[PDB]
Structure 1
Amino acid sequence: HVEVAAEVIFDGIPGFPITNSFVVAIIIDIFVIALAVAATRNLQMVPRGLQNVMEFILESLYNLFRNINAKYVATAFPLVATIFLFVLFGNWFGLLPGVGSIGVCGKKLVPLFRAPAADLNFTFAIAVISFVFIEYWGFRALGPGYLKKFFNTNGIMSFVGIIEFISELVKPFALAFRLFGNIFAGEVLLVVMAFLVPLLLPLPFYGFEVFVGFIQALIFALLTYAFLNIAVT
């Protein structure tokens, strides 16, 4: 009764199908916006509590991105910071009890109550937004572009470059597949290993999964902005 699934739609179809992926995306958006307004409204010169936590998180991210690159850190910070916050909170919400058990209102079709990254559509959307962002900034910075990735041996053999172009193409696919695969495989780990001794056994892999969710958020954001750095140069 593991009941593993790749994609679900949880009804909610008033003419337009509203998957439970959208349900969890909206609830996480509500949570993150509530956290944002709670931090911003009580604005103090010396931050404490929740405001201190938010300031520390953005300061750490901004420092990391400046370490990657200094010129485009401010321009590209909104996208990558939203990526990190959104997918991190989705992955962490994927650990709350009720990932599959909720659904008792007929098979137990589930309110997603897990990471929205556990579905292909979310990861593909984030991958394509990242890819179009990278390409737009590559055009803006390099100018005409394609000096490399388009034959034209100029200090580097043209043979390398068709390979770079196809690597550029596969990069969004690799990113989306990495996020989806890690989250979905961790979910299936939790469920399947709960099939075996559901008591006191799932805690180590549970903690491993919360760590993997955080690391996946950070690594996806870092890879996106590092690809921006590669495209600029």
Structure 2
Amino acid sequence: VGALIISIASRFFLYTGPPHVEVAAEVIFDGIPGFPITNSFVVAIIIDIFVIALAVAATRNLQMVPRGLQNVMEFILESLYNLFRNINAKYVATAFPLVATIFLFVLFGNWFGLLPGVGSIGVCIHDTCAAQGKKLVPLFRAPAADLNFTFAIAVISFVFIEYWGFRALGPGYLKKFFNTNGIMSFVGIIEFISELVKPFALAFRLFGNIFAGEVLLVVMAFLVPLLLPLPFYGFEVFVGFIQALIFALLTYAFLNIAVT
């Protein structure tokens, strides 16, 4: 070790090799008439099948003493259970299949976005397709970078919280719909506006916090491609894990605050 930090490996084709930026918001892969399949939907399937396979492997021959995949699955599930019970101890059972799967889907979606080939591998500086007459559309885009997936999660969560806020405390909802006297009347409209904002805020938060990370990884691959984006690879791993956990946490916290 010593002080052998030379960083000469960092001085390898600083910006001549990789393309300039090459980023976009959403694209279409199609492949079937009717539904315009996207690259995000491809990952949203390759993660869904991955999660299902992981579940089958973990629950394969459930033993009394945990081992391996069963053990880590039990640890994750019970940690999430305790985390949600810390907020509300009554609706954990009902809200768990949705909130836990939000976490388990968003986590693997974000972590798949850092797999090699997310932007390098695609279909029809100059990459490869650009040598031909057709543009290079990238495959394997992280699903959380899609505004059709994050908004789907947000609207599902909003429907869930509204359903369980109307199934409890009665259909009054006088705290936000309308109040007769006091400053609570003025507070109610602001609360309604915030509640309407809430799914938009959640979807925009997830989509931005993943898309900006992917764009950062690509652009810092553009300049000094080797050994410089390692700390930011780590930071984006952590940010993916966070944005996975906090989405679940916020869904359950909003559910609890709606019930109360």
| TM-score class normalised by the smaller sequence | over 0.9
Does the aligned pair in 1 maintain the 2:144–2:210 contact within 8 Å?
Answer: yes
Does structure 2 retain, via aligned residues, the 8 Å contact 1:138–1:232?
Answer: yes
1:188-224 residue CA offsets vs partner (Å, 9 max, x unmatched): 1001111110011110011100100000000011000
> How big is each residue's C-alpha offset from its partner over 1:132-170, in whole Å with a ceiling of 9 and x where there is no partner?
000000000021132111231577621111000000000
8 Å CA contact retained: 1:138, 1:228: yes
Q: Is the 8 A contact 1:95 1:114 kept in 2?
A: no
- Unaligned stretches of 5+ residues in structure 2: 1-19, 124-132
CA separation in 2, counterparts of 1:15 and 1:8? 16
Take 1:113 and 1:20, find their aligned partners in 2: how far apart are those partners? 6
Distance of aligned partners of 1:49 and 1:15 in 2 relative to their CA distance in 1, 3 Å threshold: same
1:111 to 1:36, Cα distance in 2 relative to 1, 3 A: farther
Q: Quote the offset at 1:10 in angstroms.
A: 1.9
Is 1:24–1:115's contact at 8 Å kept on the other side of the alignment? Answer: yes
Q: Is the 8 A contact 2:179 2:188 kept in 1?
A: no
Distance verdict in 2 for CA 1:82–1:140, change over 3 Å: same
Kept after mapping to 1: 8 A contact 2:44/2:143 = yes
Whole-Å separation in 1 of the counterparts to 2:146 and 2:61:
36
Q: TM-score, normalised by structure 1?
A: 0.96
- Cα distance, 1:111 vs structure 2: 4.5
- The Cα of 1:87 is off from its aligned counterpart by 0.5
Give per-residue Cα distances to partners, 1:58-78, cap 9 Å, x unaligned.
000000000010000010000
8 Å Cα contact 2:144/2:206 also seen in 1 = yes
After TM superposition, what 4+ stretches of structure 1 lie above 4 angstroms from structure 2? 153-156
Deviates more, 1:14-23 or 1:197-206: 14-23
Q: Of 38, 47, 56, which aligns to 1:28?
A: 47
**Distance in structure 1 (CA, Å) of the matches to 2:241 and 2:149:** 17
Tell me, yes or no, if the aligned pair for 1:101 and 1:110 is still in contact at 8 Å.
no
Relative contact order: is structure 1 or structure 2 higher (C-alpha 8 Å, sep ≥ 6)?
Answer: 2
How many pairs are equivalent?
232
> Contact 2:122–2:139 at 8 Å: present in 1 too?
no
Report which of the two structures shows the higher radius of gyration computed on alpha carbons. Answer: 2
Change (3 A) 1:61 1:137: same
Q: Which of 72, 84, 102 matches 2:121?
A: 102
Deviates more, 1:10-19 or 1:36-45: 10-19
* TM-score, length-scaled by structure 2: 0.86
The CA distance in 2 between the partners of 1:108 and 1:208, in whole Å, is: 31
C-alpha distance in 2, partners of 1:113/1:61?
28
| Contact 2:39–2:141 (CA under 8 A) maintained in structure 1 | no
Distance 2:177 2:135 in 1: 52
**Structure 1 pair 72–218 and aligned structure 2 pair: CA distance change class (3 A):** same
Describe the shift of the 1:57–1:39 C-alpha distance in structure 2 as closer, same or farther (beyond 3 A). same
RMSD of aligned C-alpha atoms?
Answer: 1.4
1:110 deviation in Å?
3.7
| Contact 1:87 1:115 (8 Å CA) reproduced | no
What displacement does 1:112 show?
A: 3.4
Q: 1:154 to 1:229 in 2, by over 3 A?
A: farther
| More moved, 1-10 vs 209-218 | 1-10
Deviation at 1:39, TM superposition (A): 0.6
Tell me, in whole angstroms, the C-alpha distance in 1 between the residues paired with 2:257 and 2:111: 30
Residue aligning to 1:207: 234
Larger helix percent: 1
Contact 2:99 2:248 in 1 (8 A): yes
For the 8 Å contact 1:124–1:176, the answer to whether it is kept is yes
- Tell me, what secondary structure is at the counterpart of 2:227? coil
Match of 2:27 in 1: 8
| CA-to-aligned-CA distance 1:6-63 (integer Å, 9 cap, x gap) | 0111232423211111111110011000000001112101101110000000000000
Query: Does the 8 Å CA contact 2:175/2:184 hold for their aligned counterparts?
Result: no
Q: 1:155 to 1:231 in 2, by over 3 A?
A: farther
